[model samples]
Target: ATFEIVNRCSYTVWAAASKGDAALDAGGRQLNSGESWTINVEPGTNGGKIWARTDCYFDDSGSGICKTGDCGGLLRCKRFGRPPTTLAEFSLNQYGKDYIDISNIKGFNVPMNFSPTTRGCRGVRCAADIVGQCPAKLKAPGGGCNDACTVFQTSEYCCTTGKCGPTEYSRFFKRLCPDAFSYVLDKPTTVTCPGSSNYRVTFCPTA
Candidate 1:
């Protein structure tokens, strides 16, 4: 599947995607407001995730720190980056179908739109002003919400034993974006489609 990644935020964002040790589009690209990039993802790409980093400064050699979603202190990430960032996670052609979802489990940075461009699959969007609405306890130092799990790290929020369920924090995010995964046990949000659809991942999507 192909991904058309676009940045529509008033501020700049650095986009990154990773699948195992493999990096897509050299792992990252700095996108100014309204800038865009495109990449082709193959079938059977598992554990694939795409996200945007904010408030960054990378040298010509592509090494720096982003206030949100910093990976290995480099512009080209080799692993899943730090949290408090929105995630567009998907696996293509898994069991002859593609599964895609917007996950705020890491927490929300920029608003996002993840959608199939063909095949009539449902689109998932989380375009609320999450940063501004974030509760004081869940707010990140940079810009974005910190998930209760990341902040508290208890089983209640982290679901370490798989027995935990939604909390007030998760419910807060769910109220903002119904289609996003707000916690570890959050359900029924994954969008599935046959392996025939391309995708559009838009940052700072207008509601």
Candidate 2:
């Protein structure tokens, strides 16, 4: 299977993919506006994830930083990108289905859409543009929407004391991208196909 990453925004982006400490495979280069990249994902590739890096500056040796989605501050990410990033998560070839979803549980710095590219695969898509309307309280210094739990940390926001539900922040993200996970425990995250289908993860799908 393949995870095709596309950057449709009017800016440069660094695409990254990680599968838990197995020498993550990611593009150490930049994708200008309307550019794209791809990473090969083997069969039975479970617990894999993908995301975009923006506004980065790296040395010639592939070491530096990104304003958002910096994975251990390396050009080639060895760990998962930081918070306030739009994540496309996957657990494939397991439980008789390919589970996938766009998670804003950490919040969003970019817009994204996850779609199946395999033949006969259907009804598997999660798309949203969180950059357009990030709430003020949830805004981060690096230009992304911070997760509610990371920002507020209140009982209602963090689900502390088992007494949490949708507050203004959660509801805002939930309403905008109901198809994606909103908070830490947002429900109804069900994007799966009956087989191992290749996926297309697009940043700025509307652009």
Candidate 3:
């Protein structure tokens, strides 16, 4: 039951978790520069995602828009975050190990580094400069690049039909962040370590 969210970025970031997911230590808070939040995940947690929101404008009541990764304008997330956000995914106690990944399948806003804290465990990270080099068709209205499916909204890009395959667009993200899930079929990017293997999710990891 652990997720160490470290904000290495230069700006403030609102680290968010899905409601009723990990039972976060703090429902919501503005993490200052160089701060970190370590959350203990309850047992039996499955498929829960954690992400960082940036350039937000929340009022005293905590309702406002974020430049990236806004969750329905709600201070307390009651649902999944909007697209164009880098995500730290978790599936605990799967086959006696914890499965994890930093997914770009939904699109990537902030660059992330997801790695195991324990030795001998596999580490995966995506420290790409995606924002400065985002493609035009997949560019988000707020900022950052959008997934091919979200940008094109077609059966091929979205994989609405049978076993979805990758396109030129998905390949772009894959090449940028090979460890991240570029599409739904990106199972190959997943990593597994024994349960209780703590991990860190760092925003804007340096090269």
Candidate 4:
């Protein structure tokens, strides 16, 4: 499958994708407002995730720090990014179906929409102004919202106990972006699409 990442925010963002430790699309690229980039996603890929980095300054060699979603401070990411980030996750061609989801489990930075372009599959979006409405405890230094799991690290939030449920913080995220996975046990967050269907991932989407 292929993905078209579009930036609709009024600021610059560096888009990134990772499959396990493998970086895709050279790991990252700068996308200004209204800009878009395309990348291919191989089949049988699991643990794949994509997100955007903000307020970054990369050197000529593509090594710099971003305020949010910095993957080893490299232009090409080799691993998953830090918390306080929004994510689009995928497991492609698993049992003949493609599982897609929007996740706020690591927190929220920018609003996002993940939907099929050609197939009539159901699309999911988390386009709420979560950064602006973030609770003080969940607010990070940058314009991002932190999940309770990252901030508190308790069983209720992190679910390390293998048995946990939603918290007030998770509810806060769920209320705004109901389609996203707000916590470890969030239900009905994953949506399935037909195999080989292409997708579009838009940041700061209007709808």
Stretches off by above 4 angstroms in model 3 are 19-27
List TM-scores for all candidates, in order: 0.96, 0.88, 0.92, 0.97
The parts of candidate 2 lying over 4 Å away from their true place are 120-129, 154-156, 159-163
Tell me the lDDT of model 1 at 93: 85
lDDT of 1 by residue, 148-169 (tens): 9999999999999989989999
- Judged by whole-model lDDT over C-alpha atoms, candidate 2 comes out at 0.77
Query: Please, what are the lDDT tens digits per residue for candidate 3 over residues 39-79?
Result: 77765568778888888888888899888778888665656
Better of 1 and 2 by TM-score: 1
User: Per-residue lDDT tens digits of candidate 4, residues 31-89?
Assistant: 99999999988887888999999998999999999999989888788788887889999
Model 3: colliding residue pairs? 1-41
RMSD of each: 1.2, 2.3, 1.9, 1.1
lDDT of 2 by residue, 1-207 (tens): 777788888888988788757534553457888877877877787777788888998888889889888888888876778877888888888977788887777778888878888765543333555666777778898888888887866777777776566677877778888778776667867676766788788878877
The model with the greater lDDT, 2 or 3, is 3
Q: Is candidate 3 or candidate 4 better by TM-score?
A: 4
Task: Give the 10-residue window scoring lowest on summed lDDT in candidate 3.
Answer: 19-28
What C-alpha lDDT, on a 0 to 100 scale, does residue 42 get in candidate 4?
Answer: 82
How far does residue 67 in candidate 2 sit from its true spot (Å)?
Answer: 0.8
The count of residue-pair clashes in candidate 3 stands at 1
Report the candidate with higher TM-score, 2 versus 3.
3
